[PDB]
Amino acid sequence: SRSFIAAVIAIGGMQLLATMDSTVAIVALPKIQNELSLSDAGRSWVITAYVLTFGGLMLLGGRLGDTIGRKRTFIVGVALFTISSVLCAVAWDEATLVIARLSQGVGSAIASPTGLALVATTFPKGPARNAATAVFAAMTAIGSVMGLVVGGALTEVSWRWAFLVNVPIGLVMIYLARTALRETNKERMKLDATGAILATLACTAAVFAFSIGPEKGWMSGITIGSGLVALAAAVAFVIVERTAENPVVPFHLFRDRNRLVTFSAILLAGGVMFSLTVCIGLYVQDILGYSALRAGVGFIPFVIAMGIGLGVSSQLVSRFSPRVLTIGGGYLLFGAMLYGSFFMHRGVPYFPNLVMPIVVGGIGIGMAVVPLTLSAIAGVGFDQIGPVSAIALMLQSLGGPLVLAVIQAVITSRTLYLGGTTGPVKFMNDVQLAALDHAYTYGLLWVAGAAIIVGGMALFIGYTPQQVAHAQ
Amino acid sequence: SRSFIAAVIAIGGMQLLATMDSTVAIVALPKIQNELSLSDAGRSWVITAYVLTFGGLMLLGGRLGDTIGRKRTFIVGVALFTISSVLCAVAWDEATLVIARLSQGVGSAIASPTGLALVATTFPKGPARNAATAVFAAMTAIGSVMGLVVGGALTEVSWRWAFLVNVPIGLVMIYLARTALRETNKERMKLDATGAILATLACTAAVFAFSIGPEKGWMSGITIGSGLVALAAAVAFVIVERTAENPVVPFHLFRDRNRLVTFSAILLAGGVMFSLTVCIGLYVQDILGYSALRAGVGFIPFVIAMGIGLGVSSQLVSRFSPRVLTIGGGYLLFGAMLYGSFFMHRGVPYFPNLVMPIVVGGIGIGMAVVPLTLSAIAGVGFDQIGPVSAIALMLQSLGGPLVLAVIQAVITSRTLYLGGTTGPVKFMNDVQLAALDHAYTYGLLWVAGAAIIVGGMALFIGYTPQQVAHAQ
Ligand SMILES: CC(C)=C[C@H]1[C@H](C(=O)Nc2ccc(-c3ncccn3)c(Br)n2)C1(C)C
Numbered sequence A, B: 001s002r003s004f005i006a007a008v009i010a011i012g013g014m015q016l017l018a019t020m021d022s023t024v025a026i027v028a029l030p031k032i033q034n035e036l037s038l039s040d041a042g043r044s045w046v047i048t049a050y051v052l053t054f055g056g057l058m059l060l061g062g063r064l065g066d067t068i069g070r071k072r073t074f075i076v077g078v079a080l081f082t083i084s085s086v087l088c089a090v091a092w093d094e095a096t097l098v099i100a101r102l103s104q105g106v107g108s109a110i111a112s113p114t115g116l117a118l119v120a121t122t123f124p125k126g127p128a129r130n131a132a133t134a135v136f137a138a139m140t141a142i143g144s145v146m147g148l149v150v151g152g153a154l155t156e157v158s159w160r161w162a163f164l165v166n167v168p169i170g171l172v173m174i175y176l177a178r179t180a181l182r183e184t185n186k187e188r189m190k191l192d193a194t195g196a197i198l199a200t201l202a203c204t205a206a207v208f209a210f211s212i213g214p215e216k217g218w219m220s221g222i223t224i225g226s227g228l229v230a231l232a233a234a235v236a237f238v239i240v241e242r243t244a245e246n247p248v249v250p251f252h253l254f255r256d257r258n259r260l261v262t263f264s265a266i267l268l269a270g271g272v273m274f275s276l277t278v279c280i281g282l283y284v285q286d287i288l289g290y291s292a293l294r295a296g297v298g299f300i301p302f303v304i305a306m307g308i309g310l311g312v313s314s315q316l317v318s319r320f321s322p323r324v325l326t327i328g329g330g331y332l333l334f335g336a337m338l339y340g341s342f343f344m345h346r347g348v349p350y351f352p353n354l355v356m357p358i359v360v361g362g363i364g365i366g367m368a369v370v371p372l373t374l375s376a377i378a379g380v381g382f383d384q385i386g387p388v389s390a391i392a393l394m395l396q397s398l399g400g401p402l403v404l405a406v407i408q409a410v411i412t413s414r415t416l417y418l419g420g421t422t423g424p425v426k427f428m429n430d431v432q433l434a435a436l437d438h439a440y441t442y443g444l445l446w447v448a449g450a451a452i453i454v455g456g457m458a459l460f461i462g463y464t465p466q467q468v469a470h471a472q
C-alpha cells in the first residue's frame, strides 16, 4: 500500500522534475534576457545547453545502470540535478548559467533512463507493473501543468525564484529514493568505453548541428562539419558494436517486426504530442490573449482526463490487445483535433468550446499511452532493459522537434498565403490576427493527418493480452 | 399538406422499386436455376442484363426529359417498369426472362435519373428541397430492406410470386405521379441524336466488357474487342462534343474544383456503401447462418437509424457547411466499421454486438449523404440539371463493382493464406469457416481505409452553406 505509492512516486519523480524545469525555463525567457542582457544567440543557447547534454548522454546513462547499480545511479542523478538547479538559480553571468544548464542536463540524462529500467525490474509483470506504468505516465503531465502554473505565478517578482522551486520537490524524491528502492546484489557488469564514447560524440554532434543549422545558416561549414563528424562517429559505433561484448545498443533486437512497429509508433506519437502541446500553448497565450496563469489553470481538466484515461487503460489492458486500446484512444484524439480545427476562432467562450476538446483528447491519450509503454518493455530481460529504455526515452524526446518544425513551416507558409506578416505578435493588426488564427486551425489538420499514420502503423503490433498484462 | 408528401414519395419510389427488384432478384437465383435448369452462364446473363440496360441507356434517359417532358418521361418509365415486372413473372424459357429483364432495366434507366431532376426543378431552394432530398435518400434503404424481407419470406412457396410484388407499387406510383406532379411548360428543346447514340453504345460496350471479363477471361479476344470498341466510342463522343448544341455531357462546367471533388466523393462513397452492404449481407447469411427472413428483420434498425440521421442532417445543413457534416458522418461510420472489424466472430449474441454498429453507421450515412447531393445539384441551371443528375447516379451506381471486386479479391487471398477452401460455404468444416470469418474481418479494414481516403479527399469541398441550403 504505502510502499507501492512511495516506490511509484520515487520512480516517476525524475520525469516530473525534468518537465517542470523545461516548462518553467521556457516560460521566463525574456525576463532573463532583460536581466542578463543577452542576445539572440544567448536566448538559443540557454535552451540548447539542456538538449545537448540530454541527447548526448542518453545511451551511456542507460548502460551505467548495470555497471554500478540502478539505485545508486538514480540518487546520483537526482542529487546532480538539484545541485545544478541551485547553480542555475545562483548564476550571475551568461557563462555560469550555461555551465549550470549543461550540468543539469547531464544529471537529467544520467537519471531519466534508469527510471524506466527501475519500473521494469522492481515490479514483475502483472497488475503492479500496469499501475506503475500508469503512474509513470501521469507524473509527466502533472509536472508539466504544475510547472506552467508556478512559472506563470512567479512572473511578477524575479526569474531566479522560479528555479529554486525545483529544489524542495527533488529533495522529497531523494528521500523516497532512499527507502522504497532496493538492490539485488547482482554481479556487476562492465562497460564498452569505445562504443559509449562514439555514441556520445555522435549524439552531441547531431544535436549541435540541428540546433545551429537554422540559427547560423545551413551548409555554413560548421553545420556540414558537425554532420560529417556525427556520420563518422555513428559509422564507427556501428562497426565497433558488431563484435563487442555487452553492447551499448544491441542491434540484433530490432529484427522482430513487433518491436520495430512499436518503436516507430513511439517516435511518431511523441512527435505528435510535443507538436500538439507547443501549438496549443502558442495559440492560447498569443491569439486569445490569455495570461500565463489562466493558461496554466485551464489545463487542469487535461490532467484529470489523462489520469482517468490512464487508469482505465491500466484496468483494461489485462483482457484487450494493445492495438485495440491504441486505436480506441486515437479515435477520441482525432475527434478532438477536428472539432478544434473546425470551430475555433478568436472570441469564443472557454466552457462550451475549448475545454471539451481538451477533455476528450486527454482521455484518448490516457488510453493510448499505457499499451505502447507496456509493449516497449515486454519480454526484454534484465541484462538488456537498459538500452531498450534509453532508446524509448530518446525516441520520445527526438520525435518532437522534426514534426514541430514541419508544422511551424506549414503555419508560416499558410500565414504568408493568407496575407499576413512574419513579425511579432504584439505588433499585429486585426487582419494579421485573423490570418494567424486561420493558419493555426489549418495546421491542426496537418497534425491530425500525421495522427492518421500514427494510428495506421499501430495495426501491425501483434502482441496479445497474455504477454504484457499477466504474471508468470 | 398532402401534396408535398405525394410529390416526395412519387419521386423516390423509382429508387425504391429499382432497389427492391434488384434485391429480390439476387435472393431468388438458386430457385430459378433449379426450376429452369439454367447453367451458370444463364444466371450470369440474368443478373447482368438488367445492369447492361441500366448503364447503357442512363444518359439518354436523363436527356430525353428535356425534349419530351419530365413528368411524361417519368410516367412512361414507371409504366414500362410495371409492364416488365408483370412479364418477368410469367416466363417459360430463358429468352423470355432475359428480354423481360432487359426491358425492365431500360425502363429503370429511363425513369430513375428524372427523379433528382424533379426534386431540383419542382421544389424551390430551402427547407422543401432539404426534405425532398432526405426522403428521396431514405426510401432507397427502406425499399432495400422491405424487398429483402419480401424475398426472404415469399420464396418459400413459389419464386414467380416474388416478381409480382412490384405491380401494386407501380400502380400507386402511376396514380400519385399523375395526380401530383405538374407540367414544366418549358419550351421543348432539340436532341443531339448522334452524341446520345455514341454515348449509349459506349456505355453498353463498357458494361458488356466488364460483365464478360470474369466469365471468359482477361485474355479472350472478345473482351479486348469490346474494350477497343468502347475506347473508340468514347473518343468519338468526346471529339463530337467539342461543338455540340445541346451536349449530352457538358464539359464546360467541369472547370470548378469544388464540383470535381464532389463528384469524386460521390463515386467513392457510393462504392464504399455498396461494398459494405454486399459484404455484410454475405457475412450474415454465410457464417452466422442467419436466414434471409432473419436478416431482413434484423436490418430494420438500419432503416430507422438512417431516417434519424437524414432528419437531423436536413435541419443541420441550414447553418453548417457540407464538409463538417460529411466528416462527422464519416467519423461515426469509421467508428462503427472499426468496431465491426475488431470484435466480431461466429457465435456472438445478436443484441450487444451487432445492433450498435448498424445504428451508428446508419446515423453517419444519414448525416453524410444529404450534403453531398445538395452540393451536386447546387448552382447548375434549368437547362443542365438533367445531365448533372444523370452523371451523379451513374457514378453512384458505378463505384460499387470497382471496389467490391478489389475487396473480394483481398478476402479470397486472405482466406487462402490461412488455408481455407473455395466453393460453397455450407460444405466446409470449422477450419475453413474460421478462415473465412477472419478474412471478412480483415476486409473491413480495407473498407475503412477506403472511407478514410473518401473523407480526406472530401476535405477539399469549399462550398458555403448559403449556396446549398439558403433560399433566394
Ligand atoms: C487507420 C487508422 C486505424 C487510424 C486511426 C488513428 C489513430 O488511432 N491514431 C492515433 C493513435 C494513438 C496515438 C497516440 N497519441 C499519443 C500517445 C500514443 N499514441 C495517436 Br497521436 N494517434 C485513427 C483513430 C484515425
Ligand SMILES: CC(C)=C[C@H]1[C@H](C(=O)Nc2ccc(-c3ncccn3)c(Br)n2)C1(C)C
Pocket (backbone or CB within 6 Å): B269, B270, B272, B273, B326, B327, B328, B329, B330, B331, B332, B333, B334, B365, B368, B369, B372, B450, B451, B452, B453, B454, B455, B456, B458, B459
Ligand atoms: C482526413 C479526414 C477528414 C478523414 C475523415 C473520414 C471521413 O469523414 N470519411 C467519410 C465521410 C463520408 C462518407 C460517406 N459515406 C456515405 C455516403 C457519403 N459519404 C464516408 Br464512406 N467516409 C474520417 C472520419 C476518417
